């Protein structure tokens, strides 16, 4: 491992930090609302009469199971235009509400349904918000809606005093006034009927046929959801690592019992780090606390590759009664658990070291470890970790009537090295 992370075959004598360890999970749990009846999307998608562009029909759907598998072939969904949420993974998310707004529009101006497109059918009739989440389905209706005499039922608008804010509808129809003269009357200078009937017959041009359109809107991460996928539940696991999936929230860790008190509308718990920590299970109504399993840095203490290959492994700041939980099979992401079943283990202030042995005598420090502990390669050969020696203790007798005066001397030579100029460069 240290040869892989140092890119060199011969490593020098010392300590080297390497890749951290991790605790692998065991299984997975999913907890969803358990509803029986399917969502009644059939009467929405197969209504005998649909709505106009200025009077689109809006239906909220709640308390059922979002099952779009049968919606693949039947209701064939010619448009894959879903951009807020990928439609392939639609069943993996849970929505607190879903709204279907349907109507019938001119087949040419389908692209005006998309947000940001101006005009008259997308400005004076209905427009999407800027941050809209959801998507629209558009398809042709020539056999059913269009008649040989003309489907003269759906009414479009072409004028308004000002552009309307999104998600707004009007019912009133009044003869327009567009000048100083109050032309209320019945007709006059720009005094026309507001909503005009369609003129659609199948013999017209291509793309001019009437289209059935329906937009689906939903918001996320607001409340405990009532309509989502058909995934079965399982049994809750306490104090064990697991891959949990609560209402699309996928995470890994352990789940304990917490004593905090929620509110009847509150579902998720946050912290300063913008990470979920406290959740409430949808089925049983206690408080669950989320915590990922522990980890830490790994250090290797080794002598030179010129010397033997006997190493020592130090774990960074972990309780040493908890590291035997790491010693199992198929339990740790680092697969080199052969040393994990090692030798006597001794605890320091920053973890516990495997592969050495304390000696109560004191030598000079050679390898840094921490908290005054130092390692060396010594006696048979092994690696010893001991207490750093500050030096040799030497008492000096104080006196108030004596004096120590040197009688001889010496002249010695000392060297000093100073960098003066690093190498110039240019790019």
């Amino acid at each position: 491992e240290t040869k892989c992370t140092l890119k060199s075959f011969t490593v020098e004598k010392g300590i080297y930090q390497t890749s951290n360890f991790r605790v692998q999970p065991t299984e997975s749990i999913v907890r969803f609302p358990n509803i029986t009846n399917l969502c009644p999307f059939d009467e929405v998608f197969n209504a005998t009469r649909f709505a106009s562009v200025y009077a689109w029909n809006r239906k909220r759907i709640s308390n059922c199971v979002a099952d779009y598998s049968v919606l693949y072939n039947l209701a064939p969904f010619f448009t894959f235009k879903c951009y807020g949420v990928s439609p392939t993974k639609l069943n993996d998310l849970c929505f607190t509400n879903v709204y279907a707004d349907s109507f019938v529009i001119r087949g040419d101006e389908v692209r005006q349904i998309a947000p940001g497109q101006t005009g008259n059918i997308a400005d004076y009739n209905y427009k999407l918000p800027d941050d809209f989440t959801g998507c629209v389905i558009a398809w042709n209706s020539n056999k059913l809606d269009s008649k040989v005499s003309g489907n003269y039922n759906y009414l479009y608008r072409l004028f308004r005093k000002s552009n309307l804010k999104p998600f707004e509808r009007d019912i009133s129809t009044e003869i327009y006034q567009a000048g100083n003269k109050p032309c209320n009357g019945v007709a006059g200078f720009n005094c026309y009927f507001p909503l005009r009937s369609y003129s659609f017959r199948p013999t017209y041009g291509v793309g001019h046929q009437p289209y059935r359109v329906v937009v689906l809107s939903f918001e996320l991460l607001h409340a405990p959801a009532t309509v989502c996928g058909p995934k079965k539940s399982t049994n809750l696991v306490k104090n064990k690592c697991v891959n949990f999936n609560f209402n699309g929230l996928k995470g890994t860790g352990v789940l304990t019992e917490s004593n905090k008190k929620f509110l009847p509308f509150q579902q998720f718990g946050r912290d300063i780090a913008d990470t979920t920590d406290a959740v409430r299970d949808p089925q049983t109504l206690e408080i669950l606390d989320i915590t990922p399993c522990s980890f830490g840095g790994v250090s290797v203490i080794t002598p030179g590759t010129n010397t033997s290959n006997q190493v020592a492994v130090l774990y960074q700041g972990v309780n040493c009664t908890e590291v035997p939980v790491a010693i199992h099979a198929d339990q740790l992401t680092p697969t080199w658990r052969v040393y994990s079943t090692g030798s006597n283990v001794f605890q320091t202030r920053a973890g516990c070291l495997i592969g050495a042995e304390y000696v109560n005598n004191s030598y000079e420090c050679d390898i840094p470890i921490g908290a005054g502990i130092c390692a060396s390669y010594q006696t048979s050969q092994s690696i010893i970790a001991y207490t750093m020696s500050l030096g040799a203790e030497n008492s000096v007798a104080y006196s108030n009537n004596s004096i120590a005066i040197p009688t001889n001397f010496t002249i010695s030579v000392t060297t000093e090295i100073l960098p003066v100029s690093m190498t110039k460069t240019s790019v």
Partner: protein
């Protein structure tokens, strides 16, 4: 830890991060460099002696009271009471190697302690030198400078009594030494009153130890800003990555996660650069402290206004959390009379 901080609990994010290159490897190398140099600073400052000198049991320093700064045998540690006051006054010290996993799962108040903000791969490493051995070094320096004169910085230690030692210190200023032998009791009483007033002044105000409090405050503020900055959206869809992986397909979400990863590495590198600047400043200050340690204590400095206001007489070192406190004993002329000169 780059993998957990940038791409925590996601295998595909870790693969896409490994695809980027050698950024966090260089970051880890720079952090090992700053840690090794920071241990080296404390190593070279207090290693001016090779033997741990033992203090004598006799505490009669020629009428000079000294029990405030010598280590106290009644204390279980070898700490002087001045050092204990300095240690417990700055009650914001390191606790990164105390909170183990049991303290992490202790559930104090929904785990709102530092363990919450060290779950994101941020780790504090303990220093090599512990408190008792630093105190032993300071005690050895004080024992060498209290009885062996000032020659113990030049090889062997030669025992000199305190009276003619202070007489030589007066001789190195400009006043002849003999006067000290007529003012022994008065100078001893002045020294004891001054050394009591030092502890009184330190215990008086709470705005005197800012020079060490600001360093740990800045460190904690930098860590808090780093852990708070993760809530930034960075122009993405959500601040949590697993929602992006479970909501969008793998042919359009790579742009958003790319923007998020680049922003987080930008913030991390900004933090690293700020740490480097603070390391350079601390290194310069530590070198200045080493010069003061070598010159104002192991000898008497002829430079004016370098080891205390007025003419410098002698000095004392004391340890402190991440710092050193010097006590400069110095000479100040009192009231004066003017006459006619020639």
């Amino acid at each position: 830890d780059c993998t957990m901080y940038i791409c925590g609990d996601s295998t595909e994010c870790s693969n896409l991060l490994l695809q980027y290159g050698s950024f966090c490897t260089q970051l880890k190398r720079a952090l090992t460099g700053i840690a090794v140099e920071q241990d080296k600073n404390t190593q070279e400052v207090f290693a001016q002696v090779k033997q741990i000198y033992k203090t004598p049991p006799i505490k009669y320093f020629g009428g000079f009271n000294f029990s405030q700064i010598l280590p106290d045998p009644s204390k279980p540690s070898k700490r002087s009471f001045i050092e204990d006051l300095l240690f417990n006054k700055v009650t914001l010290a390191d606790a990164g190697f105390i909170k183990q996993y049991g303290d992490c799962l202790g559930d104090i108040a929904a785990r709102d302690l530092i363990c919450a903000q060290k779950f994101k791969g941020l780790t504090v490493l303990p220093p090599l030198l512990t408190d008792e051995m630093i105190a032993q070094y300071t005690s050895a320096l004080l024992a060498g400078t209290i009885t062996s004169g000032w020659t113990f910085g030049a090889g062997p230690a030669l025992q000199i009594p305190f009276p003619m030692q202070m007489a030589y210190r007066f001789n190195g200023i400009g006043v002849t030494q003999n006067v000290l032998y007529e003012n022994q009791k008065l100078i001893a009483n002045q020294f004891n009153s001054a050394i009591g007033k030092i502890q009184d002044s330190l215990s008086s105000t709470p705005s005197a130890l800012g020079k060490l409090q600001d360093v740990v405050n800045h460190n904690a503020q930098a860590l808090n800003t780093l852990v708070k900055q993760l809530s930034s959206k960075f122009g993405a869809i959500s601040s949590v990555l697993n929602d992006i992986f479970s909501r969008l397909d793998k042919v359009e979400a790579e742009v958003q996660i790319d923007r998020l990863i680049t922003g987080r590495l930008q913030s991390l590198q900004t933090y690293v650069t700020q740490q480097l600047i603070r390391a350079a400043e601390i290194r310069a200050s530590a070198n200045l402290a080493a010069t003061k340690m070598s010159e104002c204590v192991l000898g008497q400095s002829k430079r004016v206004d370098f080891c205390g206001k007025g003419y410098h007489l002698m000095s004392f070192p004391q340890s402190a959390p991440h710092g050193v406190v010097f006590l400069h004993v110095t000479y100040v002329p009192a009231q004066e009379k003017n006459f006619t000169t020639a």
